[PDB]
Ligand binder design. Sequence first.
Ligand SMILES: [K+]
Ligand SMILES: [K+]
Ligand SMILES: [Zn+2]
Ligand SMILES: [Zn+2]
Ligand SMILES: [Zn+2]
Ligand SMILES: [Zn+2]
Ligand SMILES: [Zn+2]
Lengths: 30, 353, 385, 5, 183
Amino acid sequence: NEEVTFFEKAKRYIGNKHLYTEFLKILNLY
Amino acid sequence: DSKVSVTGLPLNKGPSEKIKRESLWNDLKTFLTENMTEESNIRSTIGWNGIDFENEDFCSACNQSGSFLCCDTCPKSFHFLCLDPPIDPNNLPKGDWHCNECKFKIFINNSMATLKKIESNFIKQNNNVKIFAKLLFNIDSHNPKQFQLPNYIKETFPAVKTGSRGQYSDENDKIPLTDRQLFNTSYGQSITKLDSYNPDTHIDSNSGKFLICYKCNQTRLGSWSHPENSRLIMTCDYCQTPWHLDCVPRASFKNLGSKWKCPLHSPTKVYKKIYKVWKKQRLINKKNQLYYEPLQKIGYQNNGNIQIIPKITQIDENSIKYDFFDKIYKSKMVQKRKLFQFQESLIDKLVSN
Amino acid sequence: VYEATPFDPITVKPSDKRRVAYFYDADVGNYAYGAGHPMKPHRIRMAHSLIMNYGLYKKMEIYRAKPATKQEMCQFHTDEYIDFLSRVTPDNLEMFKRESVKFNVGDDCPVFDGLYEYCSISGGGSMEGAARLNRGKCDVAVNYAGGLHHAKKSEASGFCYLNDIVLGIIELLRYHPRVLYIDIDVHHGDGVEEAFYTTDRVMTCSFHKYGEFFPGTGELRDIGVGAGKNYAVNVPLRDGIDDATYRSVFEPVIKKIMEWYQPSAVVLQCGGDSLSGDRLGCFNLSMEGHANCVNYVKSFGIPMMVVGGGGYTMRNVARTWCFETGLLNNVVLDKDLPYNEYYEYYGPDYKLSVRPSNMFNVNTPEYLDKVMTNIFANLENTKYA
Amino acid sequence: XXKXX
Amino acid sequence: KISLQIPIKLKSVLVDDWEYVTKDKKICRLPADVTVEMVLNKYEHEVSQELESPGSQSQLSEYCAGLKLYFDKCLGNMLLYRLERLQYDELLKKSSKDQKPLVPIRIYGAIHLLRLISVLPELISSTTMDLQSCQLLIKQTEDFLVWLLMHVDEYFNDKDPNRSDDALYVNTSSQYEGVALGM
Ligand SMILES: [K+]
Ligand SMILES: [K+]
Ligand SMILES: [Zn+2]
Ligand SMILES: [Zn+2]
Ligand SMILES: [Zn+2]
Ligand SMILES: [Zn+2]
Ligand SMILES: [Zn+2]
């Protein structure tokens, strides 16, 4: 319900695509 | 006494007319001391008593510069540690020093029929290891070398380049500074440290707009009727994200050693501290890097070596979402049931009294 | 937690009257590193003349510490390095070509003449200076020929062949539990920080310029290892720092250190290449913004030991050292210089003041906020002395 | 590198 | 010309070793815990039970003995970087002092054997062997390489000399680097 909103908020706030990719790589490593 | 000093002329000589023309317009109380100083030896440790050719200008082995022991027959020169076996620079045997190759030649008397003879006898003797016979015979004809990887090994990884003196470089080397030979000359006080001029370091070179810092979301260009409001923007060398020097707490411009890396790249080495090591491979290009797209999405582990699509595992944002949420949910509930069981065991142990 | 402040003049404290001892060997000034190297032991002679023409000899005792022996030098350095230093000379140097590369004593630090004797004078002055602080029998100990804070255990670096600050601090540690060492040179005191990097009995604190600058050590994240973790403070700054900014950074850090560490003795290295118009430094301090640090460290009232250091312009260093010694003796000296032997070095004004430039200052308030917040967060863990 | 000379 | 196939994991091991001995200024920790003799003895003692025919065993034993002799004779000549020749000299000194000759197979680990293997094709192509014998040597070396790749997790760990201890590499002081490189 709200976690979809969390991931969309992160995708919006990062603003870029390479930065969002690096963010997803950090999340995968964890 | 007539020999010139720092001043330009002999010491017992006044200034010339050229210097005085181009440099012109047109009792004391430390007599004492030998009366007031009295020695101090109050310290604790005062008990302690207390073909006329010339040799090359580089080593034949490592191909570098230094102080060489040279060979008379051939123009080779070697460092002292670059020999076999290494020689002490003090206790050097004088007399005639020859290298391995010239010594081999003078030993065989420059006759290769004798080379036939000795090599045939050698291969007859080394019958135990007959495969390594001829090899074991050639090693004695070569001057020493240093190790350098074969080029069919260095070229498997394309981000790897041999440095100037055969050193390792891996794309994190910024570059040597070429017009920083031009920097020793410079434009006057217009420094390479990037001081006193930041109107055009806040402006995107190609597009034309301003570079906006990632953390504070402003390009503090200041105003050059008040230059104390500028804030020294710098861009990352990999993703080109701009940051202020006061936001990434750095106080420098990275100019010489390596490339500066934004806080927005994940790791390249971890040190889990549980301690274990890397989850990141090397870039094996040459078009031998094969990818895999697993048929199961929400459980695949495979490495920390993924590639994100809309051996390297191809994974998508949805599987990352699900894996993150699953991990945190199950760790949450497991730690909560552990605390639950611990506290209930505590209550039955305390009421047991 | 930084906040801007002005710079009010220096007024001495009438209560803090300390029996100062001054160490000077009339031979140290005659040993010159080379033609054109920027190191002159002549700047220690110049200073002394000023100190003697202002009448400051009637106020303190003047001594001449007996020079260190090869076996009091090896309390820190190794026997091979000290033997090399004792044996080498500019003529037999070609015979020592393997130790000139091992011990680094050929060209940045050259072999010039009576090098062993200069090192002996420095070390003996400082060990003796510190030894008179332990025997109960001084309050401040001045020795300007010391302050070679770059020399390592078995290597010379930075024009320094013998680390005598370490010998002095070892001599201090025989009676004092905790010792503090403050370094206000423009460089990093890398030898003193290396020698006491894993111990919780000496706390080093150095304010330096960090960048692509010699020696390239001393980041904010170097805080020690082992039992001496959080007992090493590095404050890196940018070019052109001024008196008010340096004051607003210096005083809170040092007050916090003294409140949580509670040292038993101090050692302040007041090398003056952080002044304006130096040959190697990049700061923009004046004479009084440089002596305010000494006055503040003297405020707290514990046994103190002031040593020399760098300084590449001779007149600026001479005048600053004279002024600092004067205010250590609880007087502010006149600004008109008296007639002394080196009167003509101090043109064109012939006054006791060092002038700053209009250089641009790049140390913003938010950078110093971040630095001081990190430093205080670290220091929070050294309280229970 | 080093300090000047 | 001769061609040898090396697994890419061992190629990355070699590139890592080239990175360490070069701009990281590290040397190896000697005497190693697992030397060349131990690796080759374990390999031969594990494989000799594999195939039954006596000829395979004779060839295996001859290859291992020749590899030992050749590493002994080649290590100082061609297998050392320039930073690691001061270590070689110090070992040679402390050996000659004790009236004992240096035997490199009982000191040096598996990374130097890997160096020798990688450099083998050029040494083979510089001699005047047969072609059958070159291909026999290459076959034996490729079999050894796959066996060693099966054990790569046992001889080539990463342990950060700077962090805990007993890694396969050690840091050098400025005196070692001054006398070794810049002399
Ligand atoms: K400093
Ligand atoms: K410490
Ligand atoms: Zn060489
Ligand atoms: Zn020759
Ligand atoms: Zn910002
Ligand atoms: Zn970046
Ligand atoms: Zn300095």
